[PDB]
Amino acid sequence: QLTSKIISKFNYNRLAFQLLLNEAPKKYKVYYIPKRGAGFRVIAQPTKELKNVQRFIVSLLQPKLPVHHKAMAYEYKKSIKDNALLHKDNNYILKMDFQNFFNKIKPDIFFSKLENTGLKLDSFDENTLRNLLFWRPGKKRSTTLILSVGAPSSPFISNFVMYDFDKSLDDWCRNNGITYSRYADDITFSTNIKDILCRVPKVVKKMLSLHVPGLSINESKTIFTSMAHNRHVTGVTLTPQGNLSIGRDRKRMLFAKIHKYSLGLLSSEEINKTKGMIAFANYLEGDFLLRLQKKYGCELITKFLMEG
Amino acid sequence: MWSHPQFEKINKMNLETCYVDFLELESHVINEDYLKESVELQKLISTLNESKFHLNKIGIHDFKRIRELQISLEDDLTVFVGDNGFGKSTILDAIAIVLSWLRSNIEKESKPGTYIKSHEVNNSVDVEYASIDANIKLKDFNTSILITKAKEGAYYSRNNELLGVKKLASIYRLVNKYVDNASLPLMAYYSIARSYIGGGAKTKTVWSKFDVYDEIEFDRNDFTDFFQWL
Amino acid sequence: MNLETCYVDFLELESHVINEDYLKESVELQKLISTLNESKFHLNKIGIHDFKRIRELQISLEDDLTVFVGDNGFGKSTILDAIAIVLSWLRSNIEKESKPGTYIKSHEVNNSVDVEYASIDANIKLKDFNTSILITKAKEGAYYSRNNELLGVKKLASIYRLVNKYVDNASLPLMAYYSIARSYIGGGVDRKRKTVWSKFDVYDEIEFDRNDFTDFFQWLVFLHNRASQEKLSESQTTINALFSDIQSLKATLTQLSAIDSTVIKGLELSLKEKLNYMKSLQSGEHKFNNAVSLYDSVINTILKFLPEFQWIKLVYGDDDYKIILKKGEVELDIQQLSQGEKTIFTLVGDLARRLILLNPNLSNPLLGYGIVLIDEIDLHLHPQWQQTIIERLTSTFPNVQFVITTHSPQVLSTVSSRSVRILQE
Amino acid sequence: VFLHNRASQEKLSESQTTINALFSDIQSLKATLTQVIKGLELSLKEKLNYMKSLQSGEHKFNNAVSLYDSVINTILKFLPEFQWIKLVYGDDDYKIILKKGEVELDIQQLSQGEKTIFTLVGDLARRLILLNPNLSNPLLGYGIVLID
RNA sequence: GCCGGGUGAUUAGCCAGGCUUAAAUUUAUUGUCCGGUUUAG
Ligand SMILES: Nc1ncnc2c1ncn2[C@@H]1O[C@H](COP(=O)(O)OP(=O)(O)OP(=O)(O)O)[C@@H](O)[C@H]1O
């Protein structure tokens, strides 16, 4: 029983819950966000009343749906740093990307995976689930539901959905000395053997068609890299020696910002911006503050940190 | 193709940044006298003039006889050698296909181009769709484009990617709007059907540079207009 | 009650109710028909912006007659064809939804460097209903693109489509345009060398042409033969035997099928003719209209415009036909007439035919609604005829909006002062 | 198409009394015409011509199937890559199907080089096969050919 | 050899100029108001 728990927790009466059930898909707001460069992006986010119940729902299904350990997105105690530590000691790297990943998940494929796990659920809970976690764009007669993004429940659902693809591709990559990892809709491979990475584009396509029909690969976002060019994994640069880094351009920018701050020419907004950037870089490297202290002295750094 | 609060990040000199700085300055000043002498327009024009048009690479997947391959083209000359039935004309057709969308968008935005014919997909049982990818590198700037078509009878959808070529075409239109005699790139194609025009109009009066953008292929009547122009 | 409110409740009733008979007998249908029946079609005003040679112009049109006097370089004809472009979109949508119309060609936008796009806009008032339409096009290579808005026209055309879809024998607005080339087309009377006249045949073009007069002659012959046979009172039993002969022809076609593109086309044409004959029989059951009265009226108006001629008779004399007019004590065919009389003959014979076909049912089909654009009213007319043409046009067709450009003082003197617009440079 | 139609009816039989059936077709056409007219008369004449199959009556070694085999085998000599060429009836229409390697091909999808040879050789054999109706091997006539 | 990448250190410091090192034709740093990660109050 699942509908009883949600009704009891939020102390909803019969008529109110029914009224919300058939109007839940349309309580979304569509807006644009600026792009880094030129253009815009499309987002759609629910209301306050539907968000705090979606979060409650995902708490019940968290300890019941297995997720593969090669997915490093929206997971507790996992981040980019753990993602880049797998490929930090290999020479050749290949990167791929999907096409409209989030709108290819539908209740037809969602319930098929639920049936395979051995969990049996009532028809009423099926109706409640179908009409709560899904979005209906277009007219009221479209009868098409898409998972969408910006909702609290979508990221967890995607990881559970792609479990078979992760498992079927990981053990194939293990047998050929290839490292594999996925972040949201990015897949990365790395190896030390020459001329072995030219065969995996057909393999991923075959597993894609065999395990999750409907999905497809974007063919204009494929990249091959080696140690003689720029290498990075989701925003962290890899030194040829094999060390994580943030980049020389940002190191010089932060040094210039601190130097200008020593002359008292920094506005209050930039103090907060640089403090946050410095904290992130310190977490990424681990020895950034020592280098700054050895250059401008401990007193100035301490005063800058304590400001505000 | 829009205006932003001018995100800063690190400092650079990319053509895109100069394009968006001019757009940002547009929303404040209204008088055209200041606009025609602003240093941002001079920066944009100077950057655009020294760039050289160059197609970087191309990749063909499951199109006609070709199953999958990638080609890198030289910047001045490249020659393909082969026998009959080895897909020599397929590569040229693919290049003209991806070049027609750029041709179309210059005359007017959101205008369609050329699609894939239903008989061009491979005849193998296991195929599901066909795709073409490309890349254009003007100096530092890089753009990409993908064209695809699903096999008839399937129930799974695939669409096109067109943000890069629309962004690039907007720069050309904006420059042409403030320059009296701005130039344009040249695209042409001489197929095997040019031997028919081997020596086989209501008093045309006005000549413009947009009449050569009617088609990407030389065929039939272009010889007659040449005589009228001469 | 506004027609929009009567529209929405009918839409709801149609969506809910399913019985066709109930929908036909529904009160909402009767109210909608009554409201649509009396609604004077009227163009309020029109503005032109950077079209051809005109830079800016805003003008208001009268509801009964307006004369565009005053020569100028931009040319009066451009205004008339500007209105023709706007009117072209309404009929296309009436024939079928989302049908395109006439676009503005890129070679008519102004050549001055300042301009970047051209636009024409206008407003149509139907009692209290108000619709507006704008047609625009930008020059090649412009930074911004411009598109037309057709929500108002599509909405207006929907009620016309629905009325014909439910009720039958409905009437549609008249739109016509007589250019200056009618002299040549009308003058082809000398040699210049279908059975079921539907309603949409005239709803194909707006500009007068030679083929219109060619269609006119055949229409006259068909009306004459139909009236003569009805007057002779062919036996009703014989008429039913003709229907059984059409059934026998259908049986022969079935035998042909149970044995050929030409054969299939002929069978389809025969089936269409049989269906038209069955519809005519159904109309005949309700006593139909009066063929002799319409054939009399169409001749009578022409004779009204040419007082010298005594009478006109078809006088076929076997063959196909040979129309004969009696001038004094002589008989002459149309190929023997004068240049001035030919233009009047074709103009009136075209307007009368258009009102007859477009507006059936109505007891006097000469009282229809519409708008007529005619240029160079004073072509090949002596001054005696020039002072009476307006009176007869405004008396024979009292409910049609007229737009006229004039050139001579004789026409100008007769008209009033509230209907004359003077264009100055 | 006409060669294949006569090939199946005459050489492969599967027609029983073809002369009687075609004569009954002519009679049916006349009856239908009795109870577009020019087309019907032309169809009746065509049915009478088909009814003249027994009038011809040769069934010799140079039958329709032998001509079909000779034409196809002649074409295949100039195109060593291909395996077989066949005529396929479907969707109320006929199409030419070619075998290359392990893939089936239509006629529109060939290259220009194999199109030129296919057209030239086919027309050359069509004229000899059509102007010499008595030779045991009709590719043995006399003439002159000019090629540029 | 040449070119293109990595960056600790220097400089009224996103400059500039110095010292190292890496290689099949083979990166062009991306989405907030949601999600998890870092810091702080
Ligand atoms: N849909 C298809 N499926 C499989 N093979 C195809 C298909 N379409 C074409 N082909 C193959 O294409 C080959 C010819 O390709 P193409 O015309 O590009 O080559 P080409 O002879 O080098 O060119 P050209 O002579 O036109 O310069 C044929 O041999 C045919 O087998």
d(CA B21, CA B43): 10
Which tokens go with A165?
């693809």
B210 Cβ contact list (under 8 Å, min separation 6): B107, C140, C141
B130 lines ligand 1 (CB under 6 A): no
Is D111 annotated to bind ligand? yes
Specify burial of residue D113 (Cβ count, 10 A radius: 0-12, 13-18, 19+): exposed
- Report the amino acid identity of residue C359: N
Report how far apart, in Å, the C-alpha atoms of C153 and of each of C97, C149, C162 are: 11, 9, 15
Residue C402 phi/psi, 5-degree rounding, is -120, 135
d(CA A16, CA A49): 13
Q: What is the DSSP code string of D106-119?
A: -STTS-HHHHHHHH
Q: Radius of gyration (Cα) for chain C, nearest Å? A: 25
Query: Which nucleotides on strand E sit less than 7 A from a protein beta carbon?
Result: 4-15, 21-39
Q: Radius of gyration (Cα) for chain A, nearest Å? A: 24
CA-wise closest residue to C312 among C294, C324, C330: C324
For helices A268-285 and A288-296, give the axis angle rounded to 10 degrees.
130
**Alpha carbon C2 to chain centroid, angstroms:** 27
Report whether C39 contacts C368 (CB < 8 A). no
Numbered residues of chain D with Cβ closer than 8 Å to any chain B Cβ: 81, 103-106, 108-109, 111-114
d(CA A130, CA A1): 16
Which tokens go with A126?
């099926």
Q: Whose CA is nearest to atom 20 of ligand 1?
A: B85
For helices A248-262 and A288-296, give the axis angle rounded to 10 degrees.
40
For residue B209, what is the DSSP state?
Answer: T
d(CA B118, CA A59): 49
d(CA D77, CA D126): 16
d(CA C35, CA C29): 10
Which tokens go with A174?
């293990």
Report whether A238 contacts A228 (CB < 8 A). no
Which tokens go with C417?
């002062």
CA-wise closest residue to C334 among C161, C190, C185: C190
Report how far apart, in Å, the C-alpha atoms of A101 and of each of A48, A72, A200, C83, C227 are: 26, 16, 20, 51, 73
B105 Cβ contact list (under 8 Å, min separation 6): B111, B113, B165, B166, B169
Q: Radius of gyration (Cα) for chain B, nearest Å? A: 21
Q: Radius of gyration (Cα) for chain D, nearest Å? A: 19
For residue C125, give the H/E element and its range: strand C117-126
Which tokens go with B14?
């990319």
Pairing of strands C420-422, D82-90: unpaired
**Dihedral sign for Cα atoms in the order C78, C82, C84, C88:** positive
Which tokens go with A217?
């690969």
3-state SS assignment for residue C282: helix
A95 Cβ contact list (under 8 Å, min separation 6): A186, A187, A188, A189, A221, A222, A223, A225
Residue whose Cα is closest to the C1' of E8: A291
B2-8: long-range contacts at Cβ-Cβ below 8 A with a sequence spacing of 24 or more? Answer: B2/A34, B2/A38, B2/A39, B2/A40, B3/B27, B4/A34, B4/A35, B4/A38, B5/A34, B7/A34, B7/A36, B7/A37
CA-wise closest residue to A250 among A281, A221, A225: A281
Region of D91 on the Ramachandran plot (φ > 0 left; ψ -120 to 50 alpha; else beta): left
Report whether D116 contacts D125 (CB < 8 A). no
CA-wise closest residue to C70 among C416, C425, C410, C423: C423
d(CA A229, CA A227): 6
d(CA A113, CA C288): 70
d(CA B143, CA B170): 13
Count other C-beta atoms under 10 Å from residue A270's C-beta. 13
d(CA D116, CA A295): 80
Report whether A85 contacts A238 (CB < 8 A). no
CA-wise closest residue to C420 among C44, C68, C72: C68
Is D114 annotated to bind ligand? yes
d(CA C252, CA C392): 54
d(CA A61, CA A69): 18
**Dihedral sign for Cα atoms in the order C390, C392, C395, C398:** negative
Chains that touch A (3 or more CB pairs under 8 A): B
d(CA C372, CA C397): 11
Expressed in angstroms and rounded, the spacing between residue B84 Cα and the centre of ligand 1 is: 8
Report whether A145 contacts A25 (CB < 8 A). yes
Q: Whose CA is nearest to atom 5 of ligand 1?
A: B65
3-state SS assignment for residue B138: strand
CA-wise closest residue to C111 among C85, C87, C140, C136: C140
Specify burial of residue D42 (Cβ count, 10 A radius: 0-12, 13-18, 19+): exposed
**Dihedral sign for Cα atoms in the order A113, A117, A118, A122:** negative
D109 lines ligand 1 (CB under 6 A): yes
Report whether C171 contacts C361 (CB < 8 A). yes
For residue B66, what is the DSSP state?
Answer: E
Q: SS3 sequence, C332-396?
A: ECHHHCCHHHHHHHHHHHHHHHHHHHHCCCCCCCCCCCEEEEEECCCCCCCHHHHCCHHHHHHHH
CA-wise closest residue to B147 among B88, B216, B101, B87: B101
Q: SS3 sequence, A256-283?
A: HHHHHHHCCCCCHHHHHHHHHHHHHHHH
A291 Cβ contact list (under 8 Å, min separation 6): none
d(CA C396, CA C344): 14
Report whether C139 contacts C116 (CB < 8 A). yes
d(CA A248, CA B10): 11
d(CA C383, CA C157): 43
Specify burial of residue B146 (Cβ count, 10 A radius: 0-12, 13-18, 19+): buried
**Closest C-chain CA to B178:** C143
Chains D and C physically touch (3 or more Cβ atom pairs below 8 Å): yes
Please tell me the total number of residues recorded for chain C in this structure: 425
Q: What is the DSSP code string of chain A?
A: --HHHHHHHTT--HHHHHHHHTTGGG-EEEEEEE-SSS-EEEEEEE-HHHHHHHHHHHHHHGGGS---TTB-SS-TT--HHHHHTSSTT-SEEEEEEBSS-GGG--HHHHHHHHHHTT----HHHHHHHHTTS-B--SSTT----B--SSSTTHHHHHHHHTHHHHHHHHHHHHTTT-EEEEETTEEEEEESSSS-TTSHHHHHHHHHHHHSTT--B-TTS-EEE-TTS--EETTEEE-TTS-EE--HHHHHHHHHHHHHHHTT---HHHHHHHHHHHHHHHHHHS-HHHHHHHHH-HHHHHHHHH--
**Alpha helices, H only, C207-290:** 210-232, 236-257, 261-285
Residue C131 phi/psi, 5-degree rounding, is -125, 150
CA-wise closest residue to C388 among C409, C407, C414: C414
Report how far apart, in Å, the C-alpha atoms of A160 and of each of A108, A275, C368, C378, D58 are: 15, 37, 71, 84, 77
D108 lines ligand 1 (CB under 6 A): no
Q: How many CA atoms lie within 13 A of C45 on its CB side?
A: 5
d(CA C215, CA C222): 11
**Which chain D residues contact residue C261 at CB under 8 A?**
39
Contact B167 A38 (CB under 8 A): yes
For residue D7, what is the DSSP state?
Answer: I
d(CA C357, CA C201): 9
d(CA B55, CA B95): 10
First-to-last CA distance in chain C? 46
Chain D interface includes C265 (CB < 8 A): yes
CA-wise closest residue to C157 among C173, C176, C168, C169: C173
Interface test with D, best of C255, C263, C267, C269 (most D CBs within 10 A): C263
d(CA C298, CA C348): 9
d(CA D99, CA D81): 9
d(CA A16, CA C339): 84
d(CA B147, CA C219): 56
For residue D65, give the H/E element and its range: helix D64-78
Report whether C185 contacts C213 (CB < 8 A). yes
- Please tell me the distance in Å from B62's CA to the nearest CA on chain A: 12
Report how far apart, in Å, the C-alpha atoms of B163 and of each of A215, B60, B98, B143 are: 21, 20, 14, 9
Q: Which residues of D66-81 are buried (b: 16+ CB within 10 A; e: fewer)?
A: ebbebbeeebeeebee
Question: Which residues on neighbouring strands pair with residue C58, listed in sequence order?
Answer: C47
C42 Cβ contact list (under 8 Å, min separation 6): C63, C124, C125, C126, C401
Count other C-beta atoms under 10 Å from residue C109's C-beta. 19
B123 lines ligand 1 (CB under 6 A): yes
For residue B16, give the H/E element and its range: helix B15-26
Question: Which residues on neighbouring strands pair with residue A41, listed in sequence order?
Answer: A33
Report how far apart, in Å, the C-alpha atoms of D33 and of each of A305, C258, D22, D25 are: 106, 12, 16, 12
B84 lines ligand 1 (CB under 6 A): yes
Report how far apart, in Å, the C-alpha atoms of C221 and of each of A206, B7, C287, C315 are: 75, 80, 22, 10
- Report the amino acid identity of residue C337: L
Specify burial of residue C138 (Cβ count, 10 A radius: 0-12, 13-18, 19+): buried
Sheet order of strands, A236-238 included: A232-233, A236-238, A244-245
Specify burial of residue C233 (Cβ count, 10 A radius: 0-12, 13-18, 19+): exposed
Specify burial of residue C93 (Cβ count, 10 A radius: 0-12, 13-18, 19+): buried
Pairing of strands A232-233, A223-225: unpaired
d(CA D21, CA D53): 11
Report whether B163 contacts A39 (CB < 8 A). yes
Report how far apart, in Å, the C-alpha atoms of D59 and of each of C56, D7, D13, D70, D129 are: 86, 11, 11, 16, 17
Q: What is the resolution of this structure in A?
A: 3.0
